[PDB]
Amino acid sequence: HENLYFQGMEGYRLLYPMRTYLIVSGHGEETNVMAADWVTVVSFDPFIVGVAVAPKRTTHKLIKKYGEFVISVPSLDVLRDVWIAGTKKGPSKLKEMSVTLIPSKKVKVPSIEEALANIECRVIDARSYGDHTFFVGEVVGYTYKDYAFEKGKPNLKAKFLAHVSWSEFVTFSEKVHKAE
Amino acid sequence: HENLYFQGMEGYRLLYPMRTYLIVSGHGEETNVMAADWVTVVSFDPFIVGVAVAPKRTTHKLIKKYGEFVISVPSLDVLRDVWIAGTKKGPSKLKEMSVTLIPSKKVKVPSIEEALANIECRVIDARSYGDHTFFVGEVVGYTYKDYAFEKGKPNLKAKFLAHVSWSEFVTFSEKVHKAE
Ligand SMILES: Cc1cc2nc3c(=O)[nH]c(=O)nc-3n(C[C@H](O)[C@H](O)[C@H](O)COP(=O)(O)O)c2cc1C
Numbered sequence: 321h322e323n324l325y326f327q328g329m330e331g332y333r334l335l336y337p338m339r340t341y342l343i344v345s346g347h348g349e350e351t352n353v354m355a356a357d358w359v360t361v362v363s364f365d366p367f368i369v370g371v372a373v374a375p376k377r378t379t380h381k382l383i384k385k386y387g388e389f390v391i392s393v394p395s396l397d398v399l400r401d402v403w404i405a406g407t408k409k410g411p412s413k414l415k416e417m418s419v420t421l422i423p424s425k426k427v428k429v430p431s432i433e434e435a436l437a438n439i440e441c442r443v444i445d446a447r448s449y450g451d452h453t454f455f456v457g458e459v460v461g462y463t464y465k466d467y468a469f470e471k472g473k474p475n476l477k478a479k480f481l482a483h484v485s486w487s488e489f490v491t492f493s494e495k496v497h498k499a500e
Numbered sequence: 501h502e503n504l505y506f507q508g509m510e511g512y513r514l515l516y517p518m519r520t521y522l523i524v525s526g527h528g529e530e531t532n533v534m535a536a537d538w539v540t541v542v543s544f545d546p547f548i549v550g551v552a553v554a555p556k557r558t559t560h561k562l563i564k565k566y567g568e569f570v571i572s573v574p575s576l577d578v579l580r581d582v583w584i585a586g587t588k589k590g591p592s593k594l595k596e597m598s599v600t601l602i603p604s605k606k607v608k609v610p611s612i613e614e615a616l617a618n619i620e621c622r623v624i625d626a627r628s629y630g631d632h633t634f635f636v637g638e639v640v641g642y643t644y645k646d647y648a649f650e651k652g653k654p655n656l657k658a659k660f661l662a663h664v665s666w667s668e669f670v671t672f673s674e675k676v677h678k679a680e
């Protein structure tokens with residue numbers, strides 16, 4: 321991470337590996353995508369999600385402007401596009417990305433066709449905790465690839481993406497361990 | 501999930517598989533542990549984390565009472581204890597759990613010796629989003645197993661735990677994919 325004055329392991333790496341998602345924001349010619357690890361569910365009913373976004377991201381400006389975002393779930397197969405989303409800045413990066421933008425069902429921000437799922441969100445809160453804003457979004461729509469979630473649970477063959485450390489990513493083992 | 505009136509896939513399953521952690525709360529005879537998937541990092545500097553906890557959890561009462569919690573990172577090896585933490589209620593469950601409580605460095609809430617890491621947190625915010633409270637904690641200490649994070653990144657041999665769907669868990673593949 322940049323801004324690490326005391327060299328060593330960022331305390332945050334203790335929570336890793338973390339799932340990696342894509343955050344889509346803006347619409348029209350302003351459409352943007354960035355990578356995000358710091359995403360979680362914050363409510364079951366209603367379904368509400370949250371994402372920590374640094375004010376320096378173009379995505380931050382676009383979420384503030386439009387009050388909407390989409391969480392798109394990438395597979396290992398689109399890692400090159402995830403890397404571009406997580407390294408290049410602003411809407412001009414899309415012309416380097418293999419992904420196709422498609423209309424969302426409820427929000428104006430588009431979805432990514434290649435994504436395993438697209439979760440459409442309306443911002444209901446934004447709080448500043450340290451050096452990121454935690455954008456909290458009510459889920460107002462979603463789409464997904466049926467094979468990625470067949471029988472109502474994630475299908476581990478779909479190669480869900482996780483981030484280990486800076487440029488290193490993994491997927492999950494297919495061997496399921498049963499707790500009961 | 502219980503409280504699902506319209507049968508089908510909970511929208512939240514679109515974010516799965518998610519990492520599973522343990523949340524320790526209380527101290528002394530009031531010490532408790534529950535499982536939690538809905539945990540993320542919300543700030544790099546200072547290091548701040550957040551966890552979504554339903555008001556019905558004993559953990560919720562204990563975090564509210566003491567203003568502190570610990571995020572303990574479990575491996576696949578302690579899955580039986582994770583399952584007990586995520587199914588039984590309150591401090592009496594610990595006598596069914598294989599884990600050992602040890603003192604934390606900065607908070608009063610104890611750490612788990614068997615955990616890959618223990619992240620000690622002081623509550624700085626608590627917001628109610630739908631049916632959970634998002635407890636936001638400033639990190640004031642941490643400990644970890646050196647082999648689990650050798651060379652400053654997670655060691656995938658340590659068998660970090662992820663949750664697929666209700667009773668099903670996985671770990672990560674050891675094959676690392678490089679983005680650059
Ligand atoms: C795997 C990965 C995960 C990332 N996670 C986050 C995150 O959770 N929050 C954040 O603000 N930035 C995160 N970043 C950084 C942004 O994706 C990166 O700064 C991006 O260039 C922002 O582009 P934008 O300026 O077009 O919004 C991540 C980067 C990568 C590669």
Ligand SMILES: Cc1cc2nc3c(=O)[nH]c(=O)nc-3n(C[C@H](O)[C@H](O)[C@H](O)COP(=O)(O)O)c2cc1C
Nearest residue numbers: 535536537538553554557558559586587588589590
């Ligand atoms: C794998 C797993 C993950 C869970 N994640 C959460 C969570 O993120 N937030 C939450 O409030 N409950 C979560 N639960 C439910 C609690 O762990 C469960 O209700 C537990 O019995 C609470 O115990 P307590 O009443 O002693 O706090 C999870 C359960 C499991 C099995």
